[PDB]
């Protein structure tokens, strides 16, 4: 079986099942009819199942590529969902295994049914008590030889649903290069630069999906509702997508503040298999030689975020991704206009502390030892969490923060208040983020190294 | 008071005290005479004390330099020892503070006497029971406003004595660029390349101090006793110094195996304030795609060495020094020929596990989870310790190991056992180390960044 | 099936397999021929498998003996290797179970093939890339009801190989009574005393295997190369075996310094099932009443060695072995002349701290609390590790150190230098060790008590 073929059979099998389930649900709602246990066992509501096998013998196996490789020989499977949405990805990946390793592809009904909530397309239903009880009782609901991908069908559906809700955007609009910001003024500056890019008939950016719904293209009456204030009341983490023809745009998510939030957003955004996400936000400068408006390139993190300690113990080393570091570095060199060791007067590379206690100042003395011990240089509340999640989900990551204040030196200024020197840098900052992406996008596959491959790393990127 | 002046008064005061103490000791040994408590209180046996003050007001204070800076205004002091040995360093540092900040230097007797063992230039002079007791009873012994430097007089003397003993070399011969190796064959290759360098009338290398005593210069009968086998029985960590006129040579120390050793050696070598030390040794490849002879550039460490957990908790992040990473990377590009992106076929950049349990294989199962969790790529027994010590003592560090075997893939091999493919690269490996040093030496001050500065970082480098 | 019979069938089955594998390997090397999977399944490369069963009903079951007992009724099995080497041991053990319990012995091919490295007798192979790859791919490699013995076939082969490498000696020369030393001068004194013993036609000692190869017997031209300095460069832990007719000699291993090393050596030496190993080395005296040259009989250990914390938690109690303690005690009484309670002026029995941080002095204040809390009396770097390993592998153990300096009292000496009084003591010390062994050897089986038996203690000693 071949790539293109596999995709079609996936498309087919999937549509078939979702349609079959929707039908079953309606038939129950209207007449109270139940599905026949036999057709289900036969794979009525089941997700398609994609399997790739390798005999383990190829003359020149790619050993440098970061993804799309085989560690050993055998069969790798996984359930599939939204084949259309993932068509690009699925093809790119299957092709690599098909050609480079000459793998045996095959598609067929899995043993996992699609939870009914994931097939109810229009507005969520509003059945009475009994009606609901009956649904969750007679229909597929959510429950609490080697993996072919990182997430299985159910995990992906679960996250796709959330991404929409939190983001206030369609999962189809997300771009491969992500930018995370903890300050509202960053979106403002992003949207503005965005629309600008659309009108420029040279900028590949041809559209702008906005948290809330607004779709903005070259010909759009009043490009004002782009930042419909109502967004920040309906969506905990609004997103904005500067889309391009080939879908190599830039997606920006304003994760807001709290490690709790940074973990949550990444847990879902991860299923879309991004190429890289960058933390572009404000932070506190801990060194006296730092001036508000300066930049910090995180090269390590003191994880006082707690949110990921369970799944990733604090003594597990979270490294810097060289490729992402250079991009962030050079981007600062170019955008800030000063080439050479000149940048060091505006950029400090060092260890960043991420914490879940915003009023950490109230306990400085207690923190001070660890702060010194780790040669901390700045402090924030998302960095380490974003990095850690990138590390966990194999998504290149990087952190470039802008000093918005110096807690340890009288100058405490809560973002939103008058802080000339910080505020005036918000635009340049966002630009360093964007340029870093440009640089990384041009890197092609170089972007991805083997730095995050686990021993059991799935063949799919 | 000025730099040159301060240095001379230090020289003076020091010589005076050591001589005064040697005298006191002889006078006791010969006649049983004791020193007069009054002259001691006056500063008879005391070390000189160097003090630098800053009023805290300079128009353009260096804020980018990594060392020789002032965080705040005030008086910084420290006891001084072996002023002659540290003449170069002491001058370079005092000068920076004198000029750039216009600091007020001053020298004067401290309140700390020199332990008598540090002044007995002679290995020994046989004293019986009572003679000894009398000595430790009536003479200075080792009894377990801001800091100007990292180590005080006693701490330095302590380490200098050891460095000699462990190394089998004179502390005066140590060079600013250090190479650490865990395999005897590395020294062989180093010595050979060294002598060759001396004979070449273009290679700045004009001498070769050898563990044991042998001093080798351009005109030396038989440059054979260079590796006097007796060294490895008298010195737990033999050193070899390829000295140059200006003292910018290369020092190589064969730390042998065990984290216990790596810590010990660094504790002492640190007082000589090196410019960078590199871990050039063997390791086990944990990834299937690795081949014996390949290289590993550590970009993080899983610290299972235990030896430093007390003074530096495992959750404290130890980063990579960008400058050192590039040098190690580029050096591998150049030396292994075939540069560019082909290097990735021979060099893997990833996390290295350092452990104190050599037979860790006997417990693989237990380790496996953490190995996977940390995306480990290789395993050794010094890396993380050397790195962590560099981190602690503010000495740029880097690790570039060579896969000598693959424990997880039927190929457990021992350093001594026949390993055709590892042995073959030992020369090329050492060359990558040396080239990286060359590259870093040429970096001038660029080598030193602010990545290791603590909040209370001492003015002196 | 009977003892002698079982040993022969083991001998047979083993030789057969190793020969068959060697043949297979050659056939591959020369023609590229592969073994037939069928013959392998049949047990072509497999180790013999020794099984003993007990119906669980004997009138007077030995309940006092320390080893060779049955906890419950059932079948106890294990793979066997080098039957010839273990002939003595294997017989002695199988006999005890055969007679005392009337057990049913049986031998037969196991399910475990012998890793090819263990059958290549001469020197390790040096095949090219492909040749090696092919070997590890098509042949047995090292991959990472109740047990009859402590270690199975593979584990034993693994350690036998290492013992040779680290020790620089043939596993067949190892004697039942072991001495561990952390100072080179101990071997010197041992060798000297050894040759002396050989020449004396009353001393059972008739030979001396030396680390490096040198075999010394009564008629050996120049007994000088006994301590071939080259040993300490090729062997991380040289051994010397004072052999006797009946193999009840004394083996001395210079484990050098570091807990990492002590663990490693015991991991392997353990498979030879020694009768007892003693830690005879130097240490630091922590009590002012102690004088350099004094002895310390460890009766407990503060485990700051970290190296065994994983496998044996620090709160698990490591006791003293009464039998070994008496021997060590009396040996000090006899050898030091001082009889009765006079010994207490030269020997202090107390708790010893073992650490992996050699420059622990640099942190005294932090240690001091625990030191006091544990009534510490001396400090070293192997004791607790050797003791713990003995405890782990059921090998009676004991520690008798010699004070080589007093860190806490102005004499932070560096053993490997000019410490007059410690040097003098060495010979007497080594003699106490040797006398203790004599005493224990005479103890016959008394030596072994039930103090180390686990609940599942294997039948074999």
UniProtKB/Swiss-Prot annotation, chains A, B, C:
Keywords: Hydrolase. Pfam families: AMNp_N, PNP_UDP_1. It is an enzyme of class 3 (hydrolase). GO terms for cellular component: cytosol. One of its GO terms (biological process) is AMP salvage. Coiled coil: none annotated. InterPro entries: AMN_phosphorylase, AMP_N_sf, AMP_nucleosidase, AMP_nucleoside_Pase_N, Nucleoside_phosphorylase_d, Nucleoside_phosphorylase_sf. GO terms for molecular function: AMP nucleosidase activity. Gene3D superfamilies: AMP nucleoside phosphorylase, N-terminal domain, Nucleoside phosphorylase domain. Its EC number is 3.2.2.4. It catalyses: AMP + H2O = adenine + D-ribose 5-phosphate. Catalyzes the hydrolysis of the N-glycosidic bond of AMP to form adenine and ribose 5-phosphate. Involved in regulation of AMP concentrations. Belongs to the AMP nucleosidase family. This is AMP nucleosidase. It comes from Escherichia coli O157:H7.
